[PDB]
Amino acid sequence: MKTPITEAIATADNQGRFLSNTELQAVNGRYQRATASLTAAKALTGSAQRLITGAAQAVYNKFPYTTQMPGPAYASSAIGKAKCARDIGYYLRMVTYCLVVGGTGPMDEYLVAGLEEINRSFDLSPSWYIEALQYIKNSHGLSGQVANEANAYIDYAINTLS
Amino acid sequence: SGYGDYSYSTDRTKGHVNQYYV
Amino acid sequence: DISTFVIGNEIENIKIQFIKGQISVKEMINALGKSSVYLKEFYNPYPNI
Amino acid sequence: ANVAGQEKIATISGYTWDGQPQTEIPGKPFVKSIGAMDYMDGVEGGDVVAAKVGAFWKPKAPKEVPYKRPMGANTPELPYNTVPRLV
Amino acid sequence: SIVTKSIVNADAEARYLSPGELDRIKSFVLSGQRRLRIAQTLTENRERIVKQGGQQLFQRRPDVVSPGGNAYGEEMTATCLRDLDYYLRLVTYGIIAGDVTPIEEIGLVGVKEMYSALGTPISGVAEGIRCMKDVACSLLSGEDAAEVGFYFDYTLAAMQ
Amino acid sequence: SIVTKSIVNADAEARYLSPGELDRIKSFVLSGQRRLRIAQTLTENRERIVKQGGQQLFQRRPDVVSPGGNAYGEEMTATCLRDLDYYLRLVTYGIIAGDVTPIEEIGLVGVKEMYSALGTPISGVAEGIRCMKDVACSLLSGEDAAEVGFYFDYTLAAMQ
Amino acid sequence: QLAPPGIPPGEDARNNQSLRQYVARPVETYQKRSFATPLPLTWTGETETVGAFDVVVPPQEKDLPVSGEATSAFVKYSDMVRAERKAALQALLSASAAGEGRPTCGAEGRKFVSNANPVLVNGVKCVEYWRK
Amino acid sequence: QILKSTKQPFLESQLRFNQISIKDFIKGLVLSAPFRDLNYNVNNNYRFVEICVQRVLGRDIYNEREKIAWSIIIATQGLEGFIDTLLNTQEYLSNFGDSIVPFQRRRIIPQRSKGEMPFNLKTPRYGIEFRSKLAATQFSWASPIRRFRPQEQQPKAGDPALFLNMVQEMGPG
Amino acid sequence: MQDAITSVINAADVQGKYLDANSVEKLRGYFQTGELRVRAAATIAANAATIIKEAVAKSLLYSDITRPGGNMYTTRRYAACIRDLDYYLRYATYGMLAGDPSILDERVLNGLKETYNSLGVPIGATIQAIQAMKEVTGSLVGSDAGKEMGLYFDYICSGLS
Amino acid sequence: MQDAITSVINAADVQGKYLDANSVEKLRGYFQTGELRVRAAATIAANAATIIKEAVAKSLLYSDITRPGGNMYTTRRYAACIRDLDYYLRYATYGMLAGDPSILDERVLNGLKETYNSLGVPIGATIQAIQAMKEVTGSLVGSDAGKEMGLYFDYICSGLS
Amino acid sequence: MLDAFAKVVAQADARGEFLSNTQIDALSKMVKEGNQRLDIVNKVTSNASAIVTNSARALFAEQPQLIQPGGNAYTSRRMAACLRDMEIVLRYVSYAMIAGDSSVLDDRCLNGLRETYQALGTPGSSVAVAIQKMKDASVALANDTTGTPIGDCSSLVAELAGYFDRAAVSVV
Amino acid sequence: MLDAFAKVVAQADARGEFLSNTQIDALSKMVKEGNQRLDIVNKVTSNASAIVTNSARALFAEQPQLIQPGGNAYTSRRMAACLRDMEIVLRYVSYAMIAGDSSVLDDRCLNGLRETYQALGTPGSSVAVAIQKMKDASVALANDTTGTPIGDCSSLVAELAGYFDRAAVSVV
Ligand SMILES: *CC[C@H]1/C(=C/c2[nH]c(/C=C3N=C(/C=C4\NC(=O)C(CC)=C4C)C(C)=C\3CCC(=O)O)c(CCC(=O)O)c2C)NC(=O)[C@@H]1C
Ligand SMILES: *[C@@H](C)[C@H]1/C(=C/C2=NC(=C\c3[nH]c(C[C@H]4NC(=O)C(C=C)=C4C)c(C)c3CCC(=O)O)/C(CCC(=O)O)=C2C)NC(=O)[C@@H]1C
Ligand SMILES: *[C@H](C)[C@H]1/C(=C/C2=NC(=C\c3[nH]c(C[C@H]4NC(=O)C(C=C)=C4C)c(C)c3CCC(=O)O)/C(CCC(=O)O)=C2C)NC(=O)[C@@H]1C
Ligand SMILES: *[C@H](C)[C@H]1/C(=C/C2=NC(=C\c3[nH]c(C[C@H]4NC(=O)C(C=C)=C4C)c(C)c3CCC(=O)O)/C(CCC(=O)O)=C2C)NC(=O)[C@@H]1C
Ligand SMILES: *[C@H](C)[C@H]1/C(=C/c2[nH]c(/C=C3N=C(/C=C4\NC(=O)C(CC)=C4C)C(C)=C\3CCC(=O)O)c(CCC(=O)O)c2C)NC(=O)[C@@H]1C
Ligand SMILES: *[C@H](C)[C@H]1/C(=C/c2[nH]c(/C=C3N=C(/C=C4\NC(=O)C(CC)=C4C)C(C)=C\3CCC(=O)O)c(CCC(=O)O)c2C)NC(=O)[C@@H]1C
Ligand SMILES: C=CC1=C(C)[C@@H](Cc2[nH]c(/C=C3N=C(/C=C4\NC(=O)[C@H](C)[C@H]4CC)C(C)=C\3CCC(=O)O)c(CCC(=O)O)c2C)NC1=O
Ligand SMILES: CCC1=C(C)/C(=C/C2=NC(=C\c3[nH]c(/C=C4\NC(=O)[C@H](C)[C@H]4CC)c(C)c3CCC(=O)O)/C(CCC(=O)O)=C2C)NC1=O
Ligand SMILES: CCC1=C(C)/C(=C/C2=NC(=C\c3[nH]c(/C=C4\NC(=O)[C@H](C)[C@H]4CC)c(C)c3CCC(=O)O)/C(CCC(=O)O)=C2C)NC1=O
Ligand SMILES: CCC1=C(C)/C(=C/C2=NC(=C\c3[nH]c(/C=C4\NC(=O)[C@H](C)[C@H]4CC)c(C)c3CCC(=O)O)/C(CCC(=O)O)=C2C)NC1=O
């Protein structure tokens, strides 16, 4: 993955040399930010279920056709509604992975690589997931540098979908 | 034969029969 | 196997004492048979005959 | 094996889906990855809640006493101008 | 119960029950009035003991309810609280039986095989029972909280 | 089949099979490459033979499907056609067995006890099989409609 | 022969290696390179491919209007059970007997069981050799 | 791996404006971040030489010692010196120069029907040496969406549910 | 009491499915041998007394079960044998036509070995009589027909054992 | 306990004859599928817990057996199931390698249906669990290998019925 | 790569003889059926995204363990590479239908695909199930009239199902 | 290549789960060590020329057949390749050090190396002697005080010694 640690090994490995003091400073800056990062990931995990059921409801309020239109792509059945909340939980889980790791590396590998090809193939709309991520950005309830770290990876997902 | 054990009659259970709608 | 009729806390006393080599097989079987896992299954529900 | 990985006690190198053994270096089977978590203490029964392994009531001593000493009569024997070949 | 295994103990030994065994069957049945009061408190407090039980469980283990957790969604969370209603029920049996024999052969024997085979983190369900214990002992006096809590921590011990 | 009851006939009489019995087992097995054609026609026409079969049954007996009829609603009407799929299947067995022995001990022996005990009008289910017979014989020609219809009317006879 | 693959012949590094530090040369061949993969023959008049002139759509529910010794044997046959069956047909209809007993299944369920095969209960006759 | 997560839109812009050549475009695709994440991080130094000889030089590895000889360029000079050394061989400049995209040279004999197993199929992105580590896992205790009831759902042969969407067709006439 | 067609229909019916290609595949295999079984059952009906006379004279005619004290001494006891051997040659003929040995255990095998032990009839000599009777039956009906009729004789001998 | 080679040798030995062309003809047929069976038994060993978790969740996990009263309610009783289903998926793997279902009735089938009736275990839900377990096993090993592994599952389901 | 016309020339060349009069007339029947071959291919490429997506959707309904997370085709990237495989096989099956010979299908699509999936760990039995769903989705869209004149295309949809069966066997 | 933090993320994605509360508290102890994990990497990088050369010189004194004519480290090109290999294994041990965790060690360095030295003739039992000499030169230099505050780094030099033991048993 793309962590602050593996982007320091890779900078030294790309020229075939040892870890200089340029690379120890980058690893040290990961350790100073990790205190705010591991309390945001702990708090998004602790309120994950109340954040996913709320954000799926925010999508159905803004786009109410998704609960009424027949077809496989829409949440107009009990099976389609469970697959919608499965996807909100995929996006929230990758955010708390990026907070633990310390960079946009888990969701680059598991989520955003190949995402445009799925939404074109299975007729899903990236505006459904932007509205779901704007709920979590406004409803996680964090404050300080804890909220700065959580919103920095939520905004990374909104920029790839848009 | 124990604090939890099976008797057929108390089984109130569509599993010896298999109408899968229940 | 012990799995579906034990709780985990019963005969780890005897396994770790045997895996360390502290007791031979016959002591391991005798200590196995005279544990309450045995009489809870082979002595309780059957007669003495 | 799934419980130990799910409990973060230790990840057990199993089999890939076709049934070949897993391994980090392709020479031998069941080699594992290591680093920064197997040497860190205090998390041995980590994620097993209220686990009580060893003297949990006290922090262990530092024990940072690294020195090698002349080991008379038990310094290991090995050939000269050579390196012993494993059987 | 204490009556049935004090019998099967003296049953195996080819003997009758000693004063040590018969002065405790005696001591247990005079204790029976106080046991039903304790179980009567937990009987119609299951609405709060379970719902507040799963309260602290999710605040302490948000992984199990987060997307990817075993109890994720409206469905699993309902079953997530269903098991706590089970184990809260077995503690009411153990209090009236004066022993964890009802809890032993129900919900404890081979419990790790079930939860490992269901994908559920067995440590997570142990955290759930501990959260129920603080709610249960908060509903009773000190003399009772040494019992009602006493059966929970046995379930905590066997569940790991 | 004709083979099994031509045996059990001569079995009871303490004798072997006569030329009258063995020139018909012989005559039946040479008839055996044409049944598998007749039964093959009814096998993958059950979609049309069973409806229509239930087509004319409701047009001739609207009471059974009207409110109060035994096959009323979306539920019973599905089972209303299920039995016709059963009896259409047994006729395929009788055609290949060359006898109503498969239809005898399945769907005919004690059939009045079942349908009387289910509240179903046994005359109504007899009307259903007759409607299937006109659809079945309309799918075939020559001898056969004299065969495929021949097994239905036996089922009509025993079903009243 | 030659050197092994890749080894420049004459520049081997195991010429005067000591035996105490000698390491056995692993075996490696020209298999897993792509130049030595066996291609289709295709100059002996054989390509490995398949296309048109291969596929046939065979109708094998419908071989033909089936052989004459089925139709021949399919009739003779029901000239010899026709007199049987319609004798057995209205042996059912005005065998409209009355009813005994109490109906044990709804309104039916009387003395005799519906459409029971009498040959089974009546065909197994117990017999005593030297019957007495 | 032709995804728009892996497109290189600024390398493409410098090729359209005649700033770089195709030899610089081919170099920039090997040193790109999708190629290091999906290919270089799942091979060792020996199988990655086999991948980059088959795809840059257009021909197969001669023997198992050509893999050993070139894998020490990656370990001591990094990946950027290995693709400068490969692109400056005379095998490259005689075949593709700096203006032609590489291809698999002489794969099929002119009169034959079969070929030589094209190189994207001969070496996929990881092999046997990384199979026992990153091989996904059919049924992985992931706890995915549940199905709930099953014998109603695709009914058994004797069930009456099969003729339900046929009851409307029978209808009233 | 099921023939090959009854057994095929039962297994195809017991799963509630139609007669697919595999069920009809065995049925076609039975109709192919339909011509062989009738001629096999034809000659066996003709030479019923001759086959039983050949088997007893070839297996247990002069052994000491035939002499006094043996299990077959008195004329009532001897006459019970050829009566008894007639059923084995007869019911085996039924199994050969029906193509299914269900009739044997339904009407012959059940309570048979439990009956001979009651009377004290030697099961050892009984099977060898049926084996010898199987040997002569292969003489009449030919090789493959003898293979068919022989396939039900040892079925009797197996269960009677 | 015989494999395909043991059964071929037994039948060729029981007549006292050598291994003729027909006996070796089946043996060559078994050696051809020898490569398929090992890879089939390979992946089944890897995904043993995953297959059983898929079968119970697809067949009887969502039914009412698990209710207080159903046959699978208590944790000891639930844990006995996956222990019990492990044998069916394991012994079926042995039959798939040996190419002969003799090991199943030798070590699984005998006294099995007579045991479930004693405990009161529902044979109906048991077979559907094995049928669902057969369905997932065809997912992993492929079509023909699933046909092989599936051929011993219904053998268990048939005899257990 | 060689089509049906070039395969009877390649076989006649290894005999060293001209094509016969019955070998020209058998090729004149393949010219007369050319417009109906061109409408098999026109219907399976004008619906190429519906053959692939509806058959993938029917596969994860039947085999739902392929999409948990952790499984073989989930990383948004393993799902996109799974639909890439179904789109490649449908491309080369359609190439073999316009040629009349399955030469291009196994020279450059099926050549080494069974051993690619074994080195990766991809289940080849599930790829064969996915090809069989693209098959009957393609033969159902082949024998519907819908802008074609009425006639008999029965031996052409039997050949199209033969390349789908060749690909599904060659992958496991 | 993934660190200690991305290792527990990759293990939780195969289950599809969030991280536990004890898993996040065990990652807060690796952050708390921190400054002194960076002291160990700084101490074996600042002496990397002398770890290699002092333990190369000690290797040819005990095994003099390695530099005899015909021996494996006899020529200018073969001697410079033994010192190049010791400097590479020391490089990937310190990487499995800066990031916490051996995935540069046994994907980039140790994978395929045992079978490579056998193809070259290099005695892998003698490469292991040269790795074990660099281990003693590194752990004697990891626990010296010399500009660091006094404390307990014993659980981190037990991890550094564990990487050297892993490279020395996977080379033969
Ligand atoms: C739904 C499909 C099943 C599935 C597919 C799947 N395949 C891959 C990876 C590869 N597929 C190929 C196949 C071809 N490449 C070609 O060039 C051609 C001819 C034009 C074919 C037929 C190759 C070479 C690869 C791997 C190389 C690469 O991706 O760079 C993957 C991804 C595997 C991975 O981890 O990368 C998937 C998921 N998987 C399933 O589960 C379905 C059953
Ligand atoms: C089977 C696949 C179909 C079907 C096909 C028929 N098409 C017939 C004639 C026809 N088709 C085309 C279009 C074709 N020519 C092209 O150049 C291209 C694309 C570039 C395509 C798709 C044309 C122009 C013609 C007219 C020429 C001719 O008739 O030969 C056809 C013949 C009709 C007849 O019997 O006379 C058939 C049978 N018809 C079907 O029912 C199935 C679905
Ligand atoms: C002559 C009497 C023999 C014979 C022997 C050959 N030996 C070859 C190579 C060889 N020999 C040894 C052992 C040697 N090396 C040592 O270090 C010691 C003791 C300290 C001894 C005895 C080794 C390790 C090797 C391989 C390395 C090398 O090339 O020297 C040899 C050459 C083999 C080849 O290159 O193919 C031969 C030919 N020669 C004969 O013909 C008879 C049998
Ligand atoms: C362990 C092998 C050593 C040792 C290490 C300690 N270092 C301690 C604190 C500390 N380390 C740093 C430097 C940090 N920034 C960097 O750029 C690098 C790498 C070049 C590193 C490690 C700083 C700035 C500090 C002080 C900051 C703070 O403590 O908040 C330390 C803690 C002190 C203590 O526990 O008393 C230890 C133990 N000490 C040893 O004795 C062994 C040899
Ligand atoms: C909910 C916000 C809306 C919605 C959701 C919906 N999604 C699907 C189908 C898929 N979603 C994915 C996405 C991912 N898979 C991954 O592995 C990852 C990374 C971990 C992501 C982001 C995929 C691959 C599919 C298709 C495969 C599948 O079915 O699982 C559906 C089903 C659509 C269908 O079956 O065709 C639905 C209903 N749709 C809505 O209406 C909500 C507004
Ligand atoms: C030195 C202590 C021991 C020794 C070493 C030795 N090695 C070689 C040759 C090679 N070594 C490698 C090693 C690597 N390649 C990699 O990519 C990595 C990271 C994975 C490693 C560790 C390679 C590729 C070669 C061959 C290329 C080259 O020219 O170096 C030699 C030379 C062998 C020769 O000249 O034929 C030597 C001498 N040998 C000893 O005796 C010491 C015990
Ligand atoms: C003097 C008057 C006279 C006749 C009319 C025929 C009548 C006749 N046809 C067949 C029998 C047959 N005849 C055919 C022939 C054909 N099927 C076709 O579709 C083609 C048109 C044709 C071949 C070119 C076939 C295939 C059978 C076998 C029928 C079966 O499958 O049972 C047989 C039985 C065996 C035989 O001799 O072939 C007889 C007696 N024979 C006569 O002696
Ligand atoms: C009386 C003793 C006893 C127990 C304990 C018991 C448990 C039990 N738990 C189940 C499911 C379950 N249990 C959970 C539980 C949890 N998820 C979490 O995150 C938490 C850690 C945990 C609860 C606190 C979940 C999510 C399921 C559904 C799993 C699935 O659908 O795959 C099931 C299957 C469905 C059912 O029949 O209810 C059983 C039988 N049965 C018993 O007889
Ligand atoms: C193979 C021989 C065979 C037959 C025939 C058979 C019949 C049969 N018919 C049933 C029900 C039923 N059958 C009917 C039938 C009808 N309603 C009408 O109006 C019509 C007159 C008639 C059909 C043409 C109805 C309405 C029920 C449901 C009755 C109820 O729900 O109370 C049931 C109970 C539900 C079930 O298990 O399917 C059985 C067993 N079983 C057999 O094994
Ligand atoms: C190797 C061949 C073999 C088999 C198969 C076998 C079965 C077997 N299954 C048992 C119990 C059991 N089996 C089940 C199984 C089930 N409950 C359900 O609802 C399902 C339908 C089914 C799972 C598929 C249960 C619940 C018990 C416990 C019964 C009890 O405690 O009364 C027991 C009693 C003892 C014990 O489990 O320790 C035996 C001996 N023994 C053998 O040697």
Secondary structure, 3-state, chain I: CCCHHHHHHHHHHHCCCCCCHHHHHHHHHHHHCHHHHHHHHHHHHHCHHHHHHHHHHHHCCCCCCCCCCCCCCCHHHHHHHHHHHHHHHHHHHHHHHHCCCHHHHHHHHCCCHHHHHHHCCCHHHHHHHHHHHHHHHHHHHCHHHHHHHHHHHHHHHHHHC
Whole-angstrom distance, CA of residue L53 vs CA of residue L48? 9
Chain D partners within 8 Å of H132 (Cβ): 15-16, 20-23, 26, 29
Nearest CA in chain E to L22: E61
Token pair for residue I59?
A: 């297996």
Q: Do F31 and G115 touch (CB under 8 A)?
A: no
Do I and H count as touching (3 or more CB pairs closer than 8 A)?
yes
CB K163, CB K156: distance < 8 Å: no
CB neighbourhood size of A37 (10 A): 28
- What DSSP state is assigned to residue H138? S
CB E28, CB E3: distance < 8 Å: yes
Residue I33 identity (one-letter amino acid): T
Token pair for residue J126?
A: 């048991």
Cα-to-centroid distance, A8 and ligand 1 (Å): 32
Radius of gyration of chain L (CA): 18
Q: Is K69 on the interface with L (CB under 8 A)?
A: yes
Cα→Cα distances F97→F137, G90, I8, I31, Å: 19, 22, 10, 11
As for chain D, the residues directly before each break of C–N over 2.5 Å are: none
Cα-to-centroid distance, K137 and ligand 2 (Å): 20
Q: Which of E103, E98, E73, E101 is nearest to E86 (CA)?
A: E103
The three-class DSSP label of residue F67 is strand
Token pair for residue H87?
A: 């692109």
Residue of J75, J76, J77 to test ligand 8 pocket, by largest number of atoms within 8 Å of CB? J75
- In chain F, what is the greatest distance between 2 CA atoms, to the nearest angstrom? 59
Chain J partners within 8 Å of H146 (Cβ): 57, 62
Whole-angstrom distance, CA of residue K11 vs CA of residue F74? 64
Has E70 been labeled as part of a binding site? yes
Residue of K55, K57, K72, K84 to test ligand 5 pocket, by largest number of atoms within 8 Å of CB? K57
Q: Which of H39, H122, H125, H132 is nearest to H79 (CA)?
A: H39
Whole-angstrom distance, CA of residue F61 vs CA of residue I16? 28
Spatial CB neighbours of J28, under 8 Å, sequence gap ≥ 6 = none
Residue A118 identity (one-letter amino acid): I
Q: Which of L1, L9, L10, L4 is nearest to L30 (CA)?
A: L4
CB neighbourhood size of G38 (10 A): 7
Has E80 been labeled as part of a binding site? yes
CB D32, CB D13: distance < 8 Å: yes
Q: For residue A55, what is the enclosing H or E element?
A: helix A48-62
Cα-based angle L96, L100, L104 (whole degrees, multiple of 5): 30
Whole-angstrom distance, CA of residue J97 vs CA of residue J149? 9
CB G17, CB L121: distance < 8 Å: yes
Q: Which of G89, G92, G113 is nearest to G101 (CA)?
A: G113
Q: Which of E120, L12, L15 is nearest to A41 (CA)?
A: L12
Residue spans of alpha helices (H) in chain K: 4-13, 21-32, 34-45, 48-62, 77-99, 104-107, 113-120, 124-140, 154-169
Question: What is the residue whose two structure tokens read 């207080």?
Answer: J68
CB K134, CB K128: distance < 8 Å: no
Q: DSSP for chain D?
A: -HHHHHTTS-----B-TTSPBP-SSSSSTT----SSSSS--S-TTTTSTT---S-TTSPPP----------TTTSPP--SSS-PPP-
- What DSSP state is assigned to residue K123? -
Whole-angstrom distance, CA of residue K123 vs CA of residue K121? 6
Whole-angstrom distance, CA of residue E36 vs CA of residue J61? 35
Nearest CA to ligand 6 atom 9: L81
Tell me the CB-side half-sphere exposure of residue K94, using CA atoms within 13 A: 21
Cα-to-centroid distance, L86 and ligand 6 (Å): 9
Nearest CA to ligand 5 atom 42: A84
Q: Hey, which residues does G105 pair with through a beta bridge?
A: G108
List the single residue in B6, B7, B13 with the smallest CB-CB distance to J64.
Answer: B13
- What DSSP state is assigned to residue E67? B
Q: Which CB contacts under 8 angstroms, 24+ apart, belong to D75-79?
A: D79/G20
CB E123, CB E111: distance < 8 Å: no
Q: How was this structure determined?
A: cryo-EM
Q: DSSP for H41-110?
A: GGS-TTHHHHHHHHHHS-S---SHHHHHHHHHHHHHH-HHHHHHHHHTSHHHHHHTTTTS----TT-S-T
Q: DSSP for F70-83?
A: TT-HHHHHHHHHHH
Question: What is the residue whose two structure tokens read 């990881």?
Answer: H126
Spatial CB neighbours of L105, under 8 Å, sequence gap ≥ 6 = D35, L92, L93, L95, L96, L163, L166, L167
The three-class DSSP label of residue K101 is strand
- Which protein residues are within 6 Å of ligand 2, measured from CB? K 35-36, 38-40, 42, 143, 145, 148-151, 153, 156
- What DSSP state is assigned to residue C2? G
Cα-to-centroid distance, G17 and ligand 6 (Å): 15
CB A9, CB L95: distance < 8 Å: yes
Cα-based angle I102, I103, I108 (whole degrees, multiple of 5): 115
Q: Do I94 and F3 touch (CB under 8 A)?
A: no
Cα-based angle H71, H73, H74 (whole degrees, multiple of 5): 70
Residue I133 identity (one-letter amino acid): M
Torsions phi, psi of G100, nearest 5? -90, 175
- Cβ of L14 below 6 Å from ligand 4: no
Ligand 5, residue K78: give the atom nearest the CA: 17
List the single residue in G17, G24, G28 with the smallest CB-CB distance to L72.
Answer: G17
Chain J partners within 8 Å of D16 (Cβ): 46
Question: What is the residue whose two structure tokens read 């392929």?
Answer: K66
List the single residue in K7, K107, K158 with the smallest CB-CB distance to G55.
Answer: K158
List the single residue in D2, D6, D16 with the smallest CB-CB distance to H132.
Answer: D16
Q: Do E65 and A82 touch (CB under 8 A)?
A: no
Chain D partners within 8 Å of H131 (Cβ): 16, 18, 20
Token pair for residue J67?
A: 């209710």
Burial class for C47, CB neighbours closer than 10 Å (0-12, 13-18, 19+): exposed
From chain B residues 1-20, the ones with a CB under 8 A of any chain H CB are: 18-20
Do D and E count as touching (3 or more CB pairs closer than 8 A)?
yes
Q: Please count the residues of chain F.
A: 160
Q: Which of A25, A17, A14, L138 is nearest to A5 (CA)?
A: A25
C-J contacts (CB, under 8 Å): 8
- What is the C-alpha end-to-end distance of chain F, expressed in Å? 24
Q: DSSP for chain J?
A: ---HHHHHHHHHHHTT----HHHHHHHHHHHHTHHHHHHHHHHHHHTHHHHHHHHHHHTTTTSGGGSBTBTT-SHHHHHHHHHHHHHHHHHHHHHHHHT-THHHIIIIITTTHHHHHHHT--HHHHHHHHHHHHHHHHHHH-HHHHHHHHHHHHHHHHHH-
Whole-angstrom distance, CA of residue E126 vs CA of residue E87? 11
3-state SS string over chain G? CCCCCCCCCCCCCCCCCCCCCCCCCCCCCCCCCCCCCCCCCCCCCCCCCCECCCCCCCCCCCCCCCCHHHHHHHHHHHCCCHHHHHHHHCCCCCCCCCCCCCCCECCECCCCCCCCCHHHHHHCCCCCCCCC
Nearest CA to ligand 4 atom 33: L149
Whole-angstrom distance, CA of residue F8 vs CA of residue I1? 8
Ligand 8, residue J72: give the atom nearest the CA: 40
Token pair for residue H135?
A: 């091989």
CB neighbourhood size of J54 (10 A): 24
Q: How far is H68 from chain K (nearest CA, A)?
A: 21
Residue G116 identity (one-letter amino acid): A
- Cβ of L23 below 6 Å from ligand 4: no
Q: Is H65 on the interface with L (CB under 8 A)?
A: yes
Token pair for residue E35?
A: 């046991």
Whole-angstrom distance, CA of residue F49 vs CA of residue F56? 11
Q: For residue F148, what is the enclosing H or E element?
A: helix F142-158
Ligand number, closest to the Cα atom of E127 = 8
List the single residue in H3, H34, H80 with the smallest CB-CB distance to A14.
Answer: H80
Whole-angstrom distance, CA of residue C10 vs CA of residue C23? 17
